[PDB]
Amino acid sequence: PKALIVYGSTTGNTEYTAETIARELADAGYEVDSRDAASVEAGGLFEGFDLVLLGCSTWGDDSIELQDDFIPLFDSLEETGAQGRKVACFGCGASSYEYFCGAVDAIEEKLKNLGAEIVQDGLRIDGDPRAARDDIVGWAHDVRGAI
Ligand SMILES: Cc1cc2nc3c(=O)[nH]c(=O)nc-3n(C[C@H](O)[C@H](O)[C@H](O)COP(=O)(O)O)c2cc1C
């Protein structure tokens, strides 16, 4: 299968997460395209992908704010070709915040609204993602099993 991974990461945690996931899928034989949301154009971005994994860190305090680089893609998510697309979301956050990984929640709801096929529940990482490598690898393993 061909998987596209697009991540928004301010301090590199969601980015580490996306590389962990990319490696897990590549090891299994998938063709993987892992791109920073900052370098992507939304227009037909998901076309030709069997699977699309969207990663985004959560910002804000009393409001969910999406990682800055992910914002333009989320704002134009309806142009990506998500309808019928197998997708899944992951992201880094902090459980002490009101909306822990609320960015995963917002993106998943938009994907749902665009007719995307959410193959697995979102991966929500609390704190340093390197300390949750087992969960990341496990979630990537489950997503492959799920498509
Ligand atoms: C000012 C500020 C606001 C934050 N807001 C949230 C939040 O609302 N929910 C959450 O789960 N984490 C929140 N975080 C935690 C970050 O999402 C977390 O540090 C994450 O690991 C950063 O991932 P990144 O390096 O891929 O951008 C916040 C962090 C800061 C510093």
Side-chain angles (χ1 to χ4, degrees):
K2 270 197 86 173
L4 203 217
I5 297 162
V6 174
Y7 62 88
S9 193
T10 287
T11 74
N13 283 342
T14 306
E15 182 176 6
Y16 160 81
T17 302
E19 296 155 347
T20 302
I21 295 172
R23 179 52 184 274
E24 207 273 0
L25 268 31
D27 274 355
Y30 276 48
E31 178 193 357
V32 183
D33 273 24
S34 190
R35 302 190 200 162
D36 188 324
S39 88
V40 129
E41 286 164 356
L45 183 62
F46 305 171
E47 287 179 352
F49 283 108
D50 296 296
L51 216 209
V52 178
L53 299 178
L54 302 179
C56 193
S57 45
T58 306
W59 295 88
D61 167 18
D62 293 326
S63 121
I64 294 161
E65 284 165 355
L66 268 36
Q67 196 275 157
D68 191 68
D69 296 309
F70 205 92
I71 293 173
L73 177 51
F74 172 92
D75 287 347
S76 283
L77 243 217
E78 73 292 329
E79 306 170 353
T80 59
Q83 165 84 249
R85 191 73 48 193
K86 294 185 204 282
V87 297
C89 309
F90 59 100
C92 283
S95 53
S96 42
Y97 284 76
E98 196 178 357
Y99 303 121
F100 169 49
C101 289
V104 172
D105 300 308
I107 303 167
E108 291 186 342
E109 339 194 344
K110 187 165 202 178
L111 285 168
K112 256 103 132 218
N113 292 164
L114 291 177
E117 183 193 334
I118 306 296
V119 300
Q120 194 49 49
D121 286 345
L123 177 61
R124 297 166 200 261
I125 309 305
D126 183 25
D128 198 333
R130 293 156 201 85
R133 189 183 171 273
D134 268 16
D135 291 336
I136 300 171
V137 155
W139 180 84
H141 173 260
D142 295 347
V143 166
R144 286 195 288 101
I147 77 150

